[PDB]
């Protein structure tokens, strides 16, 4: 199913965040509102969001915090990959970035 807001707030703190920090992410999920599929890669921590008004995404690990909104399947499953390919949050946005710049 999908994973809990208190599994989420331990692999946050795996990642490197605070549970002031956590507690933002959550008002995020949140916000959203949608089916919260958080995995957990290597430590890296990859949130997908699925709604009909627009797949969210977030990407947590050692302090960083990318938001996302309207993602497409495409986008989502480059990022999975890029993870599991051992790339740094960091870098996948540069990823992405090119991504938005087509």
Do not use: N
Not at 58 to 78: D, F, P, Q, T
Not at 85 to 94: K, L
Request: hydrophobic share 45%; no cysteine; proline share 0%.
């Amino acid at each position: 199913g999908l994973l809990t807001r208190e599994e989420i707030e331990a692999a946050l703190k795996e990642a490197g965040f605070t549970e002031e920090e956590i507690r933002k992410v959550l008002a995020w999920l949140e916000r959203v509102g949608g089916e919260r599929k958080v995995l957990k890669v290597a430590g890296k921590i990859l949130i997908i969001v699925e709604k009909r008004a627009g797949s969210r995404l977030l990407l947590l690990y050692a302090g960083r915090v990318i938001e996302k909104e309207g993602m497409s399947r495409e986008e989502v499953e480059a990022i999975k990959q890029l993870i599991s390919a051992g790339a740094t949050v960091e870098e996948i946005e540069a990823i992405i970035k090119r991504i938005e710049a087509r």
